[PDB]
Amino acid sequence: QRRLYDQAKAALAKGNSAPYMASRSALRDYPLEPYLAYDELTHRLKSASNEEVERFLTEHGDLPQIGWLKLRWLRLLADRGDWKTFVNYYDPKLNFTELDCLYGQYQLGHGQKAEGYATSERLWLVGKSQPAACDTLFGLWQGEGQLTEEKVWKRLKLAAEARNYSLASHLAQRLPTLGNQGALMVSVAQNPAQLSQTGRFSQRDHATADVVGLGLRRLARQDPEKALSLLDYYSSALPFSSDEKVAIAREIGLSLAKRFDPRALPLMTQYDPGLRDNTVTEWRTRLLLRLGRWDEAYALTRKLPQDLAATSRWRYWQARSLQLAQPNSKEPIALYQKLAGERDFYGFLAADRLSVPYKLGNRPAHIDPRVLQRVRNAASTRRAMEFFNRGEVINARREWYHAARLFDRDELIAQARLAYDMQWYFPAIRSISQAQYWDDLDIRFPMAHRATLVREAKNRGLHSSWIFAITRQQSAFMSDARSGVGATGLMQLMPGTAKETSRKFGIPLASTQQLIVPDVNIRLGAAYLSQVHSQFNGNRVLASAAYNAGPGRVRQWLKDTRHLAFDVWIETIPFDETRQYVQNVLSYAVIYGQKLNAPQPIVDWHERYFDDF
C-alpha cells in the first residue's frame, strides 16, 4: 500500500512524535522514512544515548543532512568531556570550523601539543572572525605562550587584507609593542593612497615595510600607475624582503597589464623570470598579444611550464602568435592541425584557422546496465526520485548531489542518464560534467524550452543558437537559479535590469519571484539581449560580454582600439569570469547551431575585427 506520510512529517518539525511512531510499522519500506527518524532523534538529541546516535549514524549515514547531526551531536560530546567518542567521529572533511577548533582543544588536553599548536595556528592565521569555540582554543594556545607578537601581527595583516577592519582594529589593540604600526596598517589598508606621503612612511623597520607593502598591493588594484612610481621609492627606503617584494610586483604588474600598459612588461619580466606564477605568465603573454607583439608572445609560449603548455589555450596562441609574426610560414598549420581535433573554443579557432570543419563527436559513453541498476537500487536515487515524483525539487536535487559526492567515474555517468531520461536537465548536466565524460552532447547540450526559445529568437531577429548558448551558460537550464550577488532565472536576469527591461521594450512583468517562469524569463531576457546586440552592431562577441559584464565595461575594454583581432580581444578581457563566459557562449552556439539544423560558425564574418575608432 501507498502512504500519505505528510501526516507524520507535519508532526515532528514542530510538535510531537506520535503520528510518526504510529505509522513506523507501515513505512519500513518507504524511502523517505529515514528523514522522519532523523527529525525524531534530533528534537530529543540532548537526551538520547551514544549507542542510539551511533546506531543511526551507521544505518542512515548516507543522508544529506547527516553532517548537521554530527555537528550537533559532537558539540554535546565535547560539552560533557566525552572525548573518546568525539575523536571516533570528528572528521575534518565536514568542514565545520567549530569542530576543527573543538578537535584543537582535545589535542591540547591529551598530550598532542605539536598537533594542537599547528592546529591552533592554522585556525588563527585566517583573516575573518572564527566561531566562539575557536576563542576557547586560542585561549588555551595563548595560555601556553604560543600567541606571540609576530602571529597576532600576521592575523592583523590577513584581516586588513580581507577588508575586515573591525577584526583588524580589535587585533591592533592587542599588540604590546607594535600598537602604532598596526593602527597605521588599518589606515593604509583603508586608504592606500596615503603612501603619497613618503616621509610619513619611511621608518626602516621590518614592521613598517609590512604596512607599505600591504598598501602598495591594494593601491595597485585601483591606482596602479601610482604604486609603480611609489615602489621605486619604497624599495630603497625600506627593509622589504625578497618575496615581500615580488608579491607587490605581481599585483601592480597584473593591474597594469589589465590596462594594456607596456610598463608591466619590464616589471613582470624581472620579478618573475622563471614563470613560476601562472597568472603573471598568462598576462605577460596576453599583454604582448594586445600590444601586437607577436614575435615576443611566441617566445613566451615555448617557455611555458608543461601544465600551461598543455592547455588548449596556449597551444592555440603558440600557433597564432607565430602566424601573426611570420605570416608566410607553414610551421603554424602543423600546430593548428594537432589542436583542431578538440571540442573546445581554442579547438574551434584552430579548425576555423585551417578552414576545416569543427569536431563535435557526440558519442554517449560505454555504459554497463549492472551499473545503471545498482545506482537505481541505491537508496539516495529512490529517495531523490520520490522527492521529484512528490514535487519538492530542492529536496530531490539535494539528494542527487550528496550521492554524487562518492560515485566513481563509471557510476556518475549512470546518474546523468537516469536524470536526462526524466526531462530533468540540470542534474544531468551536473552529474555528467563532474564525471567528465564530455562527449555525451545529447545530455550536456539539451533542447530545453525549445518551444519558447525558437519563437522568442525570431520575435527579435536573433539566430536561435545564440539564445540556447546564453541560457545554457547562464543557468545550465535551472528554471529557478540564483547567484552569489543575486541574479534570477534561466537567463540570469538581474534584479536591477529585470524591471527596466520590461518597461522599455513593451511587455509587463510582475515581481522578483515571477522571473522563475520560463515564458516570462526567456521573453524579457531576449529583449535585453537584442538591446545590447543593437548597442554593439549585432556583434555577439561584444554583446555576449555586455550581457554579463555591462555595456559600460565593454565600451571601456575598447578604448582606444584599431582593427583588433576578435581572438586577441577575447583573450585580453581583464575579467576571468567574463572571458570564460564569452568563450563558452560562442562555442555553445556552435554546438546548438548544429542541433537546431542551422550551422553557426564560432565567429561571424563581421564579428572578426572591431574597434572604438
Query: Phi and psi at residue 4, in whole multiples of 5°?
Result: -70, 80
Question: Which amino acid, 173?
Answer: Q
- Cβ neighbors of 580 (< 8 A, separation 6 or more) are none
Peptide bond before residue 330 is cis, with ω within 30 degrees of 0: no
Q: Are 116 and 142 in contact (CB under 8 A)?
A: no
The verdict on 416 and 387 lying in the same domain is: yes
The verdict on 415 and 454 lying in the same domain is: no
The verdict on 590 and 497 lying in the same domain is: yes
Report helix, strand or coil for 354.
Answer: coil
The verdict on 439 and 455 lying in the same domain is: no
Of all helices (H) and strands (E), which one includes residue 118? helix 113-124
What resolution, expressed in A, was reported for this entry?
3.2
Pairwise CA distance, residues 401 & 217, whole Å: 39
Pairwise CA distance, residues 458 & 469, whole Å: 16
The verdict on 382 and 399 lying in the same domain is: yes
Exposure b/e, 204-218, CB count within 10 A at least 16 = b: eeebbbbbbbbbbbb
The CATH number of the domain holding residue 582 is 1.10.530.10
Q: Are 553 and 582 in contact (CB under 8 A)?
A: no
The CATH number of the domain holding residue 430 is 1.10.1240.20
Pairwise CA distance, residues 273 & 303, whole Å: 10
The verdict on 456 and 543 lying in the same domain is: yes
Pairwise CA distance, residues 264 & 260, whole Å: 8
Residue/partner pairs of 81-88 with CB below 8 Å, 24 or more apart: 82/50, 83/109, 83/110, 85/50
Question: Which amino acid, 518?
Answer: P
Q: How far is CA 458 from the centre of its chain?
A: 34
State which residues form the domain around 606. Answer: 450-610
Pairwise CA distance, residues 388 & 62, whole Å: 19
Burial of 75 (0-12, 13-18, 19+ CB in 10 A): middle
The verdict on 556 and 456 lying in the same domain is: yes
- Cβ neighbors of 478 (< 8 A, separation 6 or more) are 426, 490
- Per-residue HEC secondary structure of 376-405 comes to HCCHHHHHHHHHHHHCCHHHHHHHHHHHCC
DSSP assignment, residue 513? G
Pairwise CA distance, residues 592 & 511, whole Å: 31
Q: Are 214 and 246 in contact (CB under 8 A)?
A: no
Question: Which amino acid, 407?
Answer: F
Pairwise CA distance, residues 58 & 37, whole Å: 13
Q: Are 68 and 41 in contact (CB under 8 A)?
A: no
The verdict on 381 and 433 lying in the same domain is: yes
Pairwise CA distance, residues 437 & 263, whole Å: 43
Question: Which amino acid, 225?
Answer: E
The verdict on 456 and 433 lying in the same domain is: no
DSSP assignment, residue 184? H
CA-nearest of 14, 89, 79 to 56 is: 89
Pairwise CA distance, residues 130 & 150, whole Å: 19
Angle (nearest 5°) at CA 591 between 423 and 443? 25
How many CB atoms lie under 10 A from the CB of residue 136? Answer: 15
Pairwise CA distance, residues 512 & 162, whole Å: 31
Pairwise CA distance, residues 307 & 315, whole Å: 11
DSSP assignment, residue 90? -
Q: Are 488 and 495 in contact (CB under 8 A)?
A: yes
**Residue where the block lists cell 619590464:** 266
Burial of 153 (0-12, 13-18, 19+ CB in 10 A): buried
Q: How far is CA 377 from the centre of its chain?
A: 33
The verdict on 457 and 602 lying in the same domain is: yes
The verdict on 456 and 380 lying in the same domain is: no
**Residue where the block lists cell 586588513:** 160
Peptide bond before residue 14 is cis, with ω within 30 degrees of 0: yes
Residue 549 CA: distances (Å) to CA of 488, 543, 574, 579: 16, 9, 11, 10
Please give the method by which this entry was determined.
X-ray
Residue 291 CA: distances (Å) to CA of 221, 451, 542: 21, 45, 20
Pairwise CA distance, residues 541 & 11, whole Å: 55
The verdict on 423 and 518 lying in the same domain is: no
- Bridge partners for 380 per DSSP: none
Pairwise CA distance, residues 425 & 412, whole Å: 15
Question: Which amino acid, 23?
Answer: S
Q: Are 117 and 141 in contact (CB under 8 A)?
A: yes
Grid cell of 128 as nine digits: 575573518
